[PDB]
């Protein structure tokens, strides 16, 4: 009944030293029934990454919408959109459906190509920006993620250390949520290289 917890899933993003990380589980379900273990929730438009939790139809719809908008942005601006700018575009786009909203919990992650500054941001379903330096969490196990991130996180982690921290935050949070899991992906993002790692986890 609650649209934000029909399909399940989680996203988490973290900042490190000259890097950002964003991660998600791979589950899509119909309440108790597991449907897909390959439903990735992180997308990217150029060097800006967007994770989206919530109702899966809206996740797909919003990805297509932001691909649409970032492609036109690029054609007109003659440059790739930056994380700060994209964050405002997501906020704008969500609030325009104020009284008929997309049931989602988006998370932006990326590095500004000009300043080199790591950036993350989160949103509620109607566009309120959460602009936190450390970490952003979203999904049906957001409580679990807040707990994991608050205790595991420390600032200025190197890329390969940040990978371990965010991976353990996701994994152990997902294992305390019925509607999250069935696989996981972690993106480690640096100014001009991005590595994508699929994690091994329990499949129940």
């Amino acid at each position: 009944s609650d649209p934000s917890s029909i399909n399940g899933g989680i996203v988490v993003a973290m900042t490190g030293k000259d890097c950002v990380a964003i991660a998600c589980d791979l589950r899509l379900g119909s309440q108790s029934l597991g449907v897909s273990n390959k439903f990735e929730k992180i997308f990217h438009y150029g060097h800006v990454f967007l994770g989206i939790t919530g109702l899966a139809t809206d996740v797909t719809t919003l990805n297509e919408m932001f691909r649409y908008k970032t492609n036109l942005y690029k054609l007109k601006e003659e440059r790739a959109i930056e994380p700060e700018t994209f964050t405002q575009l997501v906020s704008s786009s969500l609030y325009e459906r104020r009284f008929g909203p997309y049931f989602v919990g988006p998370v932006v992650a990326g590095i500004n190509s000009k300043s080199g500054k790591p950036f993350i941001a989160g949103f509620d379903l109607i566009g309120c920006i959460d602009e936190a330096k450390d970490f952003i969490v979203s999904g049906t196990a957001s409580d679990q993620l807040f707990g994991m991130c608050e205790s595991l996180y420390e600032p200025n982690l190197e890329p390969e250390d940040l990978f371990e921290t965010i991976s353990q935050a996701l994994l152990n949070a997902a294992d305390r949520d019925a509607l999250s899991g069935w696989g996981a992906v972690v993106y480690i993002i640096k100014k001009d290289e991005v590595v994508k790692r699929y994690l091994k986890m329990r499949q129940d």
């Binding site: 297509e64 919408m65 691909r67 649409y68 492609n71 036109l72 054609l75």
Partner: protein
């Protein structure tokens, strides 16, 4: 009332011609020449900017060649402002198609859509037509490399090599003479620049008076790359082909 001042932009002449379309085509014949040449391994777009100045900021300037998406580009001949209205509509159409089907829009479907918009202005609404002729250079996985042209009537046709704008009669004869089917992009680049060099109304063909673009599968394996040439790159290819 208002009828008195109506030019009636959408009527036939006694000979069965559309006045405004014909007069728009007359306008386009004074625009800088644009040329498209299709090869087996890519497409070339070459176009002449109209009598420029030394104080014009060329490296940030665009009046001829426009990107519609990553696979399709256009060369413009006519009113630039009119062209940008249509170009933005075409860009949106390409994105609509991509959102709907999750596949890049086939070249002809985009061309047909724009051409239908042009057609509408000749049949209803009482507005003047767009004084624009396009050359479309694009690639899709059905027909591969494709060249099209459209004009204010909304009629479009496919080409191996084609010119629009000024001196198209002279340009088309020169292209028809030297074009061959097994031609390659590097050969097509030379043909396009040689043709412009002979048909131009200017004294000499220089880098600052040109816009140049290529669409190549000369992109690192199974993909296509659009290259809008920079002023220095146009200067180099002019030296390479032995025009300057």
């Amino acid at each position: 009332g208002s009828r008195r001042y109506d030019s009636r932009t959408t009527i036939f002449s006694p000979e069965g011609r559309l006045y405004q379309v014909e007069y728009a085509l007359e306008s386009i014949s004074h625009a800088g020449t644009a040329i498209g040449i299709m090869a087996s391994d890519g497409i070339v777009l070459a176009a002449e900017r109209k009598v420029t100045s030394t104080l014009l900021e060329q490296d940030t300037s665009t009046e001829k060649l426009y990107k519609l998406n990553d696979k399709i580009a256009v060369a413009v001949a006519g009113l630039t402002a009119d062209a940008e209205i249509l170009i933005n509509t075409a860009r949106i159409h390409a994105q609509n198609y991509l959102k709907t089907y999750n596949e890049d829009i086939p070249v002809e479907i985009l061309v047909r859509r724009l051409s239908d918009i042009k057609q509408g202005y000749t049949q209803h609404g009482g507005l003047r037509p767009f004084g624009v002729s396009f050359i479309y250079a694009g690639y899709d996985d059905r027909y591969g490399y494709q060249l099209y042209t459209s004009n204010p009537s909304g009629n479009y046709t496919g080409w191996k090599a084609i010119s629009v704008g000024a001196n198209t009669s002279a340009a088309q004869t020169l292209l028809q003479m030297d074009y061959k089917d097994d031609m390659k992009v590097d050969d097509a680049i030379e043909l396009a620049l040689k043709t412009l060099s002979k048909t131009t109304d200017s004294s000499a063909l220089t880098y600052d008076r040109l816009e140049f673009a290529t669409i190549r599968k000369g992109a690192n394996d199974g993909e296509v790359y659009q290259k809008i040439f920079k002023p220095q790159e146009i200067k180099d290819i002019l030296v390479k082909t032995g025009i300057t």
